[PDB]
Structure formats: structure tokens, C-alpha cells
Symmetry: C4
Subunit: 388 residues, 4 copies
């Protein structure tokens, strides 16, 4: 086997087709399905799999009570076959913790899990299913990472971490791993003022990450990483099509180098594909809550502070709950281009649906098509009343 190199550009995105859906909450009403949150998708050279942070209990289990909680000792990164639900009997534990990332370099997979109390957390870096390196908290305030896949080029896999405040300046670092070992790390540079939960993808231009500014911004910060030089830049998506949640209404001028104001101390993990005229942004439909999901074609969104949509696709109706979203691609597929993909976490239960005492989710996932395909909408599909 050889390390994968990012040699292709993105395929032209003319619409999005259904890729995967697990219906986990529906099935888990009467099956041993693990409670999860913070899911994602990631491919090996021979298989693509769903990933998430388990809560170490099934949904029907009495221990599902209290699973709105983010960081217990009972959480772990698990993976399971594409579009199956995460069950006790089919889920493979990648590592133990409450914040994660994972990616295949073409030879083996690296998985990283962070665990610990708020003031003493640590990352353990796994490679080829063995622990290889460890990183202690540097700011003693909830060391945390992407919650979606990382990306590798010639064996080098950059990962974005943040340690420090969620409501003020924090200490973000970009680490560069190879075979699980730390080659290098660097402090965040550029104009992004706060970074969490980066969603990344790679193509010949390098690695592009769309993150969340939890502190002041409702536009999304972007980190662009050169995995050969092992350097990066940062800014915000310039477009006035704002993509965090909650967020203000879309203005006519966005902000390239500072947070667009209106909403503070909150946000949701999200993503974009930034590719000139082939640029597509994901966002919740609601400006107030994690409901609905849509894709919008916004030419040169990264650099054009006046850019507006010229095409779109609804993925989840505003009437239905969404959640985290992130990017991944099958780097090992046939063809001359990388097909952009994404997932949307469909959160069920607390805090929005409090008649149950649990919080979980299911997954829907799409990839791009060069056809202009008809659109459907893709709800979680479970009926909360059944769980009462």
C-alpha cells in the first residue's frame, strides 16, 4: 500500500444525491442501538464507515437518561458499516473519549480521542489501531478537536485542536501527524478570531477546513493548510450568506477578516466546499435553532464579500431537527475528480424534545452529482411519542 496523495480537483457540483442514511433513532426504538452524538463519515481505501461518539448506553436503556451531557467517562469514538445504525453488536471502538477525529492515510487509519476533566484533558493518537502519541492539555480548558474526519497527503495528516475559552480568545493549534507521530505543531495564525470543530477536505490545492467561531462570529472561519510545507492561513468566508447557527439575517456585505456580529457564545459545527465558481455552502434553514438544512451554490463565497446564491438544494425541511454537519470524501474512488460529500447529524431528544430524557441522533449523508437531480428532504423519521 501507498500513502494517498491529493492529486485531483473537486468534481463539478450540480446537485447532491443521497449517499447514506441510518435511521438510527427509528430502529433504536426497538433494537440495541447505542446513544450517540457528534457523528461523521470517513473512508478507508476499501470501505466507507459511519463514526460518532457513543454515550455507552442504548437508547431504550435506562442509562440513556441524562445523555444531553457532553463529556462523561462512558463516551468513545465508534465506527460502524455505512448506513447501518450504531448497535452494540456492530460498532467498533476506535478510542475512548468525548472529542475526536479520524482519517485514513492510504496505508492505515489514525484516530484521535480526547478524554479527561475540563482542566486536565489529554489526546491519545492511535495509528493502525494502536496508541502511538499523547498530547496533554496546554490551556487547561477542555482540549477539543474536529468531530469530523481529518485529511492526509503523502502520509501527513493535519488536525486542528482548540484549548481554552469558548467565549473569548483561545489557544488553537494545528498538529501535523505521520503514522501517529507528531511531526510539528503550530499556533493558529491569520484573521480567524476563534476556532472550533473544523470540517476539512483535501484536493490538489491543499487542505481546506471550515470551522466554527463560537465567540462572536456568525460567518465561519476558514483554515487553509499546506500539508507539504506544513503551514496554514486563516480568515472567514467573505460571503454575506452567513452559515453558523444561530445567526443574524443575511446582509449584503459580509466580513473576510473578522466575526460578523449579532450572535455571541454559540454556534454549530458546519462545512463548505470552497472552489471558485463551484463553491457550495451548507447551513441550517432556521437562523434561531438547529432545524432544517440546505446547500447553497455561492460563487467565490470565500473571497467575495458581496456573493449571493445562484442555486440551492434543501436537504432537511425547517420543520425537522438537524444538528452538526461536516465534510468527507472518498479519496480512493475511481475517476478524475474527488466527489464532494457531507453528512448532517439529525438530533433527537433533549433539549428540543424534552418528553424523553435522552439526546441522540441519526445520520443522513449526500455526495455531489454532475447531474441536476431532483431534491427530496430527509428527516430523522422517528416519532418521539413512541418512546414515552
Amino acid at each position: 500500500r501507498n500513502f494517498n496523495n491529493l492529486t485531483k480537483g473537486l468534481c463539478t457540483i450540480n446537485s447532491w444525491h443521497i449517499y447514506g442514511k441510518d435511521n438510527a433513532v427509528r430502529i433504536g426504538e426497538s433494537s440495541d442501538v447505542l446513544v450517540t452524538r457528534e457523528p461523521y463519515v470517513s473512508c478507508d481505501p476499501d470501505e466507507c464507515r459511519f463514526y460518532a461518539l457513543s454515550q455507552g448506553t442504548t437508547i431504550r436503556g435506562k442509562h440513556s437518561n441524562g445523555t444531553i451531557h457532553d463529556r462523561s467517562q462512558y463516551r468513545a469514538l465508534i465506527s460502524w458499516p455505512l448506513s447501518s445504525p450504531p448497535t452494540v453488536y456492530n460498532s467498533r471502538v476506535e478510542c475512548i473519549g468525548w472529542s475526536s477525529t479520524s482519517c485514513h492515510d492510504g496505508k492505515s487509519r489514525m484516530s484521535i480521542c480526547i478524554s479527561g476533566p475540563n482542566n486536565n484533558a489529554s489526546a491519545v493518537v492511535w495509528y493502525n489501531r494502536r496508541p502511538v502519541a499523547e498530547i496533554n492539555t496546554w490551556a487547561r480548558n477542555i482540549l477539543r478537536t474536529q468531530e469530523s474526519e481529518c485529511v492526509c497527503h503523502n502520509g501527513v495528516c493535519p488536525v486542528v485542536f482548540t484549548d481554552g475559552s469558548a467565549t473569548g480568545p483561545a489557544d488553537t493549534r494545528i498538529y501535523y501527524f505521520k503514522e501517529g507521530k507528531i511531526l510539528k505543531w503550530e499556533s493558529l495564525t491569520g484573521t480567524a478570531k476563534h476556532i472550533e470543530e473544523c470540517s476539512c477536505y483535501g484536493e490538489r490545492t491543499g487542505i481546506t477546513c471550515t470551522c466554527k467561531d463560537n465567540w462572536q462570529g456568525s460567518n465561519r472561519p476558514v483554515i487553509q493548510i499546506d500539508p507539504v510545507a506544513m503551514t496554514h492561513t486563516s480568515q472567514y468566508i467573505c460571503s454575506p450568506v452567513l452559515t453558523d447557527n444561530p445567526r443574524p439575517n443575511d446582509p449584503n456585505i459580509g466580513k473576510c477578516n473578522d466575526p460578523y456580529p449579532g450572535n455571541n457564545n454559540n454556534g454549530v459545527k458546519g462545512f463548505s466546499y470552497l472552489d471558485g465558481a463551484n463553491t457550495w455552502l451548507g447551513r441550517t434553514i432556521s437562523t434561531a435553532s438547529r432545524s432544517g438544512y440546505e446547500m447553497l451554490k455561492v460563487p467565490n463565497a470565500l473571497t467575495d464579500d458581496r456573493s449571493k446564491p445562484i442555486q440551492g438544494q434543501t436537504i432537511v425541511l425547517n420543520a425537522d431537527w438537524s444538528g452538526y454537519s461536516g465534510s468527507f470524501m472518498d479519496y480512493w474512488a475511481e475517476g478524475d475528480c474527488y466527489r464532494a460529500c457531507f453528512y448532517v447529524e439529525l438530533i433527537r431528544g433533549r433539549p428540543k424534545e424534552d418528553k424523553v430524557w435522552w439526546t441522540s441522533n441519526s445520520i443522513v449523508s449526500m455526495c455531489s452529482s454532475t447531474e441536476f437531480l431532483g431534491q427530496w428532504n430527509w428527516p430523522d423519521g422517528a416519532k418521539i411519542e413512541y418512546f414515552l
Copy 2:
């Protein structure tokens, strides 16, 4: 690995032997068995598997309520080991949607799933477990396909699709795929007046598909495909032994080039093996409903408008519910001929058994023998009262 070529003729069919049976509804009374419908069987070079459209819930799950419904966002094509039931923990998701086909070309498997609303559905073509090509609705009226396996020759795998009315003229296309890519498509030609849910098999003569005319015909339309020239013809089975359901009683003269009249706007997926004196037709025993199943040896049924049975075998008693049926063969078996096989979907629940709120099925499957074997009958075997 090499692409499979259709180099053999059918084995002589002198009776049918039991091949597989999953007892899914019996087992699912107390196990995490997924609700399904529209099942089939399909072989890889090293394994044969059961396939069906899941409803994204188990039978005992409260979400089984309402599963008479055909086209939700919670459906997916799944496969699972031969004669096991389709469980949450053993079912592999092939693609997402509510109409499907799948076949192995000798190197890898192609699976196709259609999803979307009635006026905006699309097919996604998967090859070697990756999405490769997409096809948008062309008539904006429930794009739909075979619901049983396709067949390949030297890498070319033809598939029959229909888009348009179920009760009048529609737009049927035959697509020719290789490695998931579209080589060619053509509009239906010939004398078949309406085409749905083709059941196909291949042999040195080419690929033969027996379909359903939902509009006016109670004889079955046939499409004969040359996978090298990538062309086809169509007509009806000439025999007065009528094989759709519901249907009129058998006359003494059938119809080769037009629907045999009596029953409109309904039908059931079915199959036949058309092979001169070695011809066998499948049909429900009842002329009114999906109950019973029998095989009848009807020499030259395809071409002889006076042909009658000279031998038969009961598969399911008229007292027991049947459903969809279709053809498949193990193209990778040893020997000098292809052994004809088929499955019968045994539907339980709604609309016929409405004391439960779900609709599901189990599978029974037979293959041909050159012996004249004794016959049994093969009911689903579940007791509805247990589910109350």
C-alpha cells in the same frame, strides 16, 4: 477476476428443489428483524445473498405501524446471508431508496436505488460499493425499476426502468451499464404496451426479462435483450396460461402482441423461464389475490398462443399468502448449464391481515432439478395472532 460471460444454456427443468427460506416473520416476532418488502436473491462469485427494501424499523418496533406505505425516506436496499432473516445486525445497506436492482458482473457488484418524491425521483448507480452515476426522472412520475436482480455479460449489465403512468402509456427505458457508467440507453420498442418490475435471467441466447403490464394486460410482457449489440425486442407471452394477478380465467387462445383483457390497473411482479420445450411459468394460484404459488411447464409458452401445461409443481398453497416473485441464477456454479432459480415473497400483514398495523414478508426460494422430485408447500409460517 474476469467479467462473467453468459456461455451456458439452462439446465433441464424436471422439478424444483428447496434452495432457501428465511422464516423472517416467525423469527421477527421475537428478534430484531427489519420490516421489508420487494425481496430478491442475487449471487456474487463466492456467495449468494437475500436482498430486499427495508422500511427502516423492526417488526416489533412501533415504527412498523404504517409500513404498507411504498416510498418513504426510511427505505433502503439491504442484503443479508442466504436464508438468514434480515436483521438490524446482519443486514448490509447497498443504497438508499424505494425501488432497486442489483447484480454482480464477475468482478464487482452494481446496485441501483431510486429515491425522491413522485415528481422528482432519481436513480443512483453504485459499483463496487461506491456511487458512480446518477439518473434524473425523465417523466416526473415515480421513476422505478426491476425489484429483482439484473444480469451482466462481459461487463455490460442491462437494466429496465419505467417513468410515467401506472394506468396508461409510460416511458420505459433500457439502460446499459458497465462498471456503473452509462454506456447507452434506449426507449422501449416492440409490442409490449406497458412495462414494470422486470424479472431477468441470462443464458447463451441473451438476456430474457419477464415483466408486468400494470395497465391492461393479464398476460406478461417479455423483453429480450442482446447485451453485446445493446438492443432489445418486446412482446407478450403468447400462452393462454395467464400469469399476472389478478387475472381472468385461462382462455384457449392467448395474445402475443397485446394485453389480454379483463383486469386493469393492477398486477404483481412475476417471472418465467422461456426455453422452448423446457419452458416453465410461475403464477399465483388465485386469480383474484396474491395467494398461492405454482410452477407450470408450458412448452413454447413464449411463441405458442395455444400452449397449455404438461407438468407442474405447487410451491405455496392457495390458503397461504404469496406476493412478488422473480428470477435469479448462480452464474458462478460448476457444471455445463445454468440452474434456473426463483424466489417468492410471502407477504404478511396489511392489507390482507389488518389486525396488525404493519406489512412485511419472508422469502422462500427454489432452484431446478433434473430429477422429478416430490413436492412440498412452503408457507411463511407465522401466526398473526402472536403479534396482537
Copy 3:
């Protein structure tokens, strides 16, 4: 891979050690464990597995009601990993039917299942997981076979079948298969007067089968098969240590060429290892019912009509229910001799325990040791009251 040849003798049997136990009924009180009966064990070159006839329902399932029944359409030969229980999710279906045998020839496995009504049953012979040959009933009276593993030599795998009365002269045939194809069959010859449910093993001397005379005999008939010449002989175990059940008390003179009288029209499947001074016989402890199990070292039991035990080992206490027993060996193990093994079916439920409405079993299995090991006893271990 090469066909296995029977080149070794039996290891010296000085005691029996625990080999496997699945505790199926205990576990099935609260797990999706299939109802079974007629179990056995059989090895591949890389794995040994448990086998049994499923009843197509779990024990806790309402369809377990009535499973005392022997021959429904819902039965199948299944296999599952050594010492695990037969669950819905881990059981592999080998073929469909209500009487079976199976064996690996060193290259692939042959499995045979019989299905059908009493007057029209048929065997389907599977090889490398595909149906290859079929055999119709020849006496129209419950065609039936070994219910434990067959044995192969240089690709030839003999199997004993019986068709006809259980209470009078019947038509027994020995079939010789290779790669699933019928090389030859012959009618039973020799002095055995009735043959059912042969338990076989192989060693350089040939293949030895210990069967059951259901009609008149409480001594066991023996069939000795030469798999090269494809011929056989038959007689009874000469020893007055009688090993059927029910049976009379042990006399001082046995019978070599006729049934030992006292009990008619009943019996249980059993086994022996007939090897001169290294001869060991299995039997129930009770003479009246299927309870208890013991091994007895009876020198030259096959040929000596005065032979008595000189050593023994209790396997299951008389206070505990037993059932069918049979022979198997790991033909692919290291060493200079074949280690004799056996299983005992531990039947729970009806008819002996009628407070439940089901009949099932678990498995215990032992192999021989050249040590003189201490003995334990091995009950099923389930408490019937828990199922009420």
C-alpha cells in the same frame, strides 16, 4: 488445498476432557437464541463448528410453542461458532430441511438436508455452499439420514440414508459422494436388521458408523465402510453392554448378528469408538429414558459377545436430561493420531418438561485424552421455572 486422507489411527483414549459447551437454553432465556434439536459438531480445516436443525423461531418467541414437532417447513440445518449458542445473528444456514448431515473433504464442505411431506421427501446435496445433486424418496416413508457429521477419504464422502418403516424392515442405502455428485449407491448388506441415524468416524481402518435399530434391537447396529472400494459390511456391537435407549438390563451374552430383544419401536441416536482394546461406548445412564450419559471402556466390544467394562467416565448425571449423541473428530489437527470426540444433546422442554410448550436443547462435547483426567458432570444448567 488437497482432499483429506484417513491416514492415522485413533489416539489412545484414557479419559475424556471438556471440548465445548454452549449453555444455549440458559442464555436463550434472555437472548435471541434459536430453538434447535438434533445437534452435532463438525470441523473444517481451519475451524470447528456446532450444527443443529433450527425450528425457525427463538425460544422466547411465541412460535416456540409446538416445537416438539419433528418435520416442519420452518426447519433448517444451521452452523455456528464452537461453544457459542445458536443465535439469530450468528447462525449460518447450510440448507433447508428436517434431517441432515455435513462434512468437509479437505477442500470444501458437503451438506445434505432432507425436506418434504412423509410420502414425498427429497435430499438436496450442497457442495461448497451450492446445490449440486438431488435424491428423491425411494420408499415414500420419511427419507432420513445421519443427524451427525459424515466422513471423507480422498474426496469420497459416504452417507447412510433410510427410507421406510421405523417399526419394521426398511430400505437403507449407502451413498458415496464426491464434490456433491453421486458416484455410487448400494443397498444395505450384512446382519443389521434396521438402521437409523448413523454416527460415523474415520481412521486408517476405514469408516466406522454406529447406528440405531429402531425396530427390535437395544444393541446398536454397526456399518463399516471402505471409502476406496465403496463397499460396506454390517452387524451389531456384540457386547452385552447394551447402548440404545430405552433398553433392557445388561445380560452376560450379547448379540452380534441380530437385535437384542426387550424394547421395540424406539431408540436414541448414539455412537461408539470401536478400536480393539481402545474401545469406548457411549450410553444414557437410564435404561428407561433419555437421562444421564456415560462412557464405558469395553475391550473388543464389537466382536466379543461377553465383553464388560473395565473403565468409565460419567458425562451427565442420571438426574439430568440428555438426548442424541454422536461422533466427530478434527481430521486437520496436528499429531500422529486422530483424537476421538463426541457431543451429547441435552434436551430441555417437552415431552419430559411440559410446563413449557417448547422443545430445545444445548450441547456439551468432549474429546479424548491420553491422561487419566478427573471427571465432572455437565448439565444443561437451565431452570425451567424461569421460562414460566
Copy 4:
């Protein structure tokens, strides 16, 4: 494949990072999780797995009643994927019995299980999943072994056994196996006065086992084995940091060649890594009961009868139940040193929590880091009240 050789030293231990955790009791509240106890971890060259003695019932099953019991016929050594729980459907049975050890030699795995009544127990030695050798009880008083992994060097795998009194002098033997065959055994020599449940690890210096003195000692006996010469020595950990449970308070002078007095006829399985200045000892926090767990860096603990801690790490709070602990390492990992690892059994249920009628456990496991990582604590996490 080649036999593994112990060619590396221990990595420098500066802290411990989370390695695995299965949350078995939490998950088993509503899933088919087997009741276990006496767990451990052991690696193959391509995978690391959890191991334990099943009780042949699930936790929610009614047969969980009475599982405080140590030695029934329903116990077996099982293994399952790292950090998954031991379920009916994912657990692989290694052998049958109520005391075990297991280890991979680089080519295949040896597993040993002891079964039988107290006065007639026997060990069966399995190699590459086949029984190879058997050992009868030599003292007729509960033949018993390590309850954690053994260690191999160039194909030779030493194992420590004890037969005889738990409250007085007993007969301990060290066996040396290769490919499951007995090369040699020897009686215990040295100054250890009672030996049970050795926890072993290997490094270039040889194989080091830390055991339990059940009779008089609250310091732990140590056996040091040369797997080439096949000889051993024994003594106690000299340190006054006492590590058995229950135990007296730590004095200022320990004992090298005799039991440190204060607590008789009890103890718990435990471990240490004895490596000069890189020495770390594990122990329960409580001196009275199996609660809490901590690691303490105690330079030259083995040889220095005045040695005290200079660093530590809490693993389980004193408020939480612990249990058995033992050593293992991934001998097949990359790098220039072997990374020390350990597991802690977290016992739930009886005798400490008697509102339930069962006894089971979950597992937490850590490995060493050369970083000085922040510490968390790792409770079982189940709420007993949920099981009522």
C-alpha cells in the same frame, strides 16, 4: 510468521493514558451482555482483545441470579473486540472452565482453561484453537491459574499454576509450553510462601510475574522466569508500599522474603511493573475492600525495603468499586520499547451491592505515556437502581 522474542525494554512510564473501556454493565442493563468476572486483555500480532470468564447467562437473564459463585459448569473463557462489551453475539469461546490464561506466541495463541469439581479439576491446553495437552490436578484442591495473560519468548510460554490450600502451604508449579505441548514443569522455588493469580509481562530481562499471597502476606510475591533456561526465582516486593487487599497500613520497612503480616486468608489479584527507577505499582485505594485504584511510582520497589512513592496517578476513585487487576503489553507494536499496560476489573453487584442477585464487572484499561498526562477517574458508571 515467526515466534515473538522479548527484545525490548519497557518504555519510560511518566503517566498512564486511557486505552480501553467497555462500559459493559451500563450497556448490559438493556442489551444481551454476558455476565463475567476475572477479565483481562491480551494481544495478537494484528489485534488486541478483552478476555473474561463468562457465567453462561446475560445480566438481565434470570440465570444471572447466583453468579457470585466462582466455579460452575456454565463458565468459559471468552474473548471479544477491544472496548466492546462481552455480548452473546460477539464473544468468541476460547475454552470451557472457571480459571484461565491465554497468550499469543507470535504464530498462534495458546489458551488454557481449568474445569472440574474441587477434588478432580483438570487443565486443557489449547493451541491455534485446538486442544493439545491436558494436566490433571496434582493436589486435588482447586487447580487454578493466572486469570490474566501469559507471555512467550521464542515459542516458549511459561504459566504459573497452584493446586492446594488457599490458607496454608500449597503446590505451585511453573509450566513451560510450546505449541501447547509441555516442555517442562518445575515446583516453585525461592522465598514466596504462597502463590495465586500471577500477572506477568515480558521484556529483555525475562518474564516478571506479580502474584498474590492469599495465606499470610499483604505484600505481593514476585516470580521471575527465564524462558530460555526455563528456570525461575521468587521473593516478595521489598517495598513497604503494600499492594494486596485487604492489607495493613504502609509501614516504613517492608519484607523481601516473607509475607508482611496483618491480614490472612484473603487477597486480590494485582500487578506491578518492576524496572528500577521506572517501577510502578498498582493497588486499591482502600485497605479494607476492593474499592478505588491507583498507580504509584516507587523506585526500586522490588529490592528496596524502605522505598516510598515519588509520583502517582488515581485510576478509580475510592468511592467506586474496583476488583482484579493485571498486566499485558502489545508485544507487536512499533517502536523501540514495550509500552506497559494494565486493566482493572470493576466489579458490580454481589457481595457489595446485594440489592441485585448477580455479580458481574466491566473493564477499564490504561497504557503508559512518556508524557506527564492529566489524570481522570474511570468508574464502571452503571446505576444499580436501574436493575431493580
